[PDB]
Write a protein that binds this ligand. Structure first.
Ligand SMILES: CC[C@H](C)NC(=O)c1ccc(N2CCN(S(=O)(=O)c3ccc(OC(F)(F)F)cc3)[C@@H](C(=O)NCc3ccc(OC(F)(F)F)cc3)C2)nn1
Length: 561
């Protein structure tokens, strides 16, 4: 079947959509080549529709069936519970699309009586009707990028049911999605790791091979490749768990009425078309993609005969490290891997390339690199080209945004030369200028929402990355050059100018005392010649990373209202 069928009605916006990077003095102090930075808008939705629309080829074989049997057997060990409406309400991210039934995410999060009553009615309907397709909205995601040489990117399309349905999805499945991937995949489950744990996993996997070869596999539009039978298989896996009787009914109803497909409506109420693939804005998008990618990849590894595979899966992101059989055989065996993935309906975007240097693999838009700590010891850490983080940071300085990618980037990429020298220096200077150091900000890391005060960054970073994150030095020539090239391209001041600026920022934070002084001492010790002794921060041991800062969860994109 075709992944989508369209009517000719357009994907329409809700509010005006800015295309060009707005300019203000503070955003310009970070990045001056503003004409290179753009936001995707509904204007390019038609271009995206053409790429995501295609027929699917699915031929399952014994290797696929063997893996599915293992997965169903593993799933049978899981006990998952129904979430109360109240817990499902509290997990709703702030600013997700309001309901068309007279309430928004803020009402849901507050457990407002009107929101709760409507959610209960949607729940009763899922228990009573297992077949009527549930309506979905299609929107063009507005995301910021830097223009490229060999290419602008069209907007991603987000497909989501109404807010009341979204809360019901958490009631029926949040506990299932929270437990099932680890039970099924064990150490291959990517979302259980911090950046430090992911790098440790990759390095250990690489070192475990006699002659390692690794590759990332880029599926062409993964959500569109997911078939009705894949979605019905995910439903069968969920049902292997020990579940509550109403959860079993609601899971079947959500699968048949929503997950397998359904009508697409634009913001103006017009019929846009029909979907027969993964909806990007449902609770099961991340879990379902992780499970389905894992099953297909593990089967394709076996179909290709790849030796001693170690896989790491985060949604549609796949990285495989195996035993090399020589360059010509590896090239042939990767083509066989691709051919099997193609038969399972996971065809390639860019064909995979065998890599013999761990640093040359990009996965979860990042690569392994090396630096040294305060004692000169080698430290592996995750980094990435800083172009998109910098372009987004400049937009977020010029415009108030609901979610701050800069904050998520400082958190995830705290040990990096670019996040420390540029992002921390810039944002702490902006927060000082605007008197906003104490205000909590939202960020989203692969759908996990967090509410964080900038003044809590040092204990959060210590707990997440370790004390070495404040002492890394001797970054690689390749890493230094990639950051330097990015700065010249975007019109960002050179690292030595940021170093000069950080000395003033660090001094201002120190003068404020308390948490602010800890920000100056720890985050900016790289900027001074005479170093301060960085001892473990007491607040780092007191906090809980996973639990104190959560502000909800989304399984996939969803429009910010
Ligand atoms: C529900 C079922 C589905 C399948 N699950 C999900 O969809 C899902 C989605 C997100 C998510 N989390 C928790 C673990 N981490 S975490 O980093 O430990 C962390 C913990 C607390 C924290 O709190 C603070 F914000 F307060 F600090 C901040 C961060 C984040 C993460 O995405 N990790 C993987 C990863 C690691 C490195 C990568 O590479 C590079 F580093 F390059 F980005 C890329 C991905 C966010 N967990 N689950």
């Amino acid at each position: 079947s075709m992944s989508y069928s369209w009517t000719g009605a357009l994907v329409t916006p809700c509010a005006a959509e800015e295309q060009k990077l707005p300019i203000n003095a503070l955003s310009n102090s970070l990045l001056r080549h503003h004409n290179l930075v753009y936001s995707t808008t509904s204007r390019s939705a038609c271009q995206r529709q053409k790429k995501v629309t295609f027929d699917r080829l699915q031929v399952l074989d014994s290797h696929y069936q063997d893996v599915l049997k293992e997965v169903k057997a593993a799933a049978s060990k899981v006990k998952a519970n129904l979430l109360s409406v109240e817990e499902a309400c509290s997990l709703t991210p702030p600013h997700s699309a309001k309901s068309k039934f007279g309430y928004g995410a803020k009402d849901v999060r507050c457990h407002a009586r009107k929101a709760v009553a409507h959610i209960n009615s949607v729940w009763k309907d899922l228990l009573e009707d297992s077949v009527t397709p549930i309506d979905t909205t299609i929107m063009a995601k507005n995301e910021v990028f830097c223009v490229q040489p060999e290419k602008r990117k069209p907007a991603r399309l987000i497909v989501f049911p109404d807010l009341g349905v979204r809360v019901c999805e958490k009631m029926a499945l949040y506990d299932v999605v929270s437990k099932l991937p680890l039970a099924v995949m064990g150490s291959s489950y990517g979302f259980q790791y911090s950046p430090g744990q992911r790098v440790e996993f990759l390095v250990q996997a690489w070192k475990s091979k006699k002659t390692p070869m690794g590759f990332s596999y880029d599926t062409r539009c993964f959500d569109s490749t997911v078939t009705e039978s894949d979605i019905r298989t995910e439903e069968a896996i969920y049902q292997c768990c020990d579940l509550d009787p109403q959860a079993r009914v609601a899971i079947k109803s959500l699968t048949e009425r929503l997950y397998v497909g359904g009508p697409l409506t634009n913001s103006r109420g017009e019929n846009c078309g029909y979907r027969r693939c993964r909806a990007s804005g449902v609770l099961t998008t991340s879990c379902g993609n992780t499970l389905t990618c894992y099953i297909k990849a593990r089967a394709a590894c076996r179909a290709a005969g790849l030796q001693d595979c170690t896989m790491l899966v985060c949604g549609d992101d796949l990285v495989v490290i195996c035993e090399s059989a020589g360059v010509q055989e590896d090239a042939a065996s990767l083509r066989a891997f691709t051919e099997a993935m193609t038969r399972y309906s996971a065809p390639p975007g860019d064909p995979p390339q065998p890599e013999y240097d761990l640093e040359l693999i990009t996965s979860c838009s990042s690569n392994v690199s090396v630096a040294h700590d305060g004692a000169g010891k080698r430290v592996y850490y995750l980094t990435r080209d800083p172009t998109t983080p910098l372009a987004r940071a400049a937009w977020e300085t010029a415009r108030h945004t609901p979610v701050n990618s800069w904050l998520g980037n400082i958190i995830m990429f705290a040990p990096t030369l670019w996040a420390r020298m540029i992002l921390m220096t810039h944002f702490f200077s902006v927060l000082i200028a605007r008197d906003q150091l104490e205000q909590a900000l939202n960020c989203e890391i692969y759908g996990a929402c967090y509410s964080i005060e900038p003044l809590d960054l040092p204990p959060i970073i210590q707990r997440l990355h370790g004390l070495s994150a404040f002492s890394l030095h001797s970054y690689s020539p390749g890493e230094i050059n990639r950051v330097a090239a990015c700065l010249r391209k975007l019109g960002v001041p050179p690292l030595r100018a940021w170093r000069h600026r950080a000395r003033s920022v660090r001094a201002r934070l120190l003068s404020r005392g308390g948490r602010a002084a800890i920000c100056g001492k720890y985050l900016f010790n790289w900027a001074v010649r005479t170093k301060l002794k960085l001892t473990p921060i007491a607040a780092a041991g007191r906090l809980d990373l996973s639990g104190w800062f959560t502000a909800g969860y989304s399984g996939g994109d969803i429009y910010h209202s």
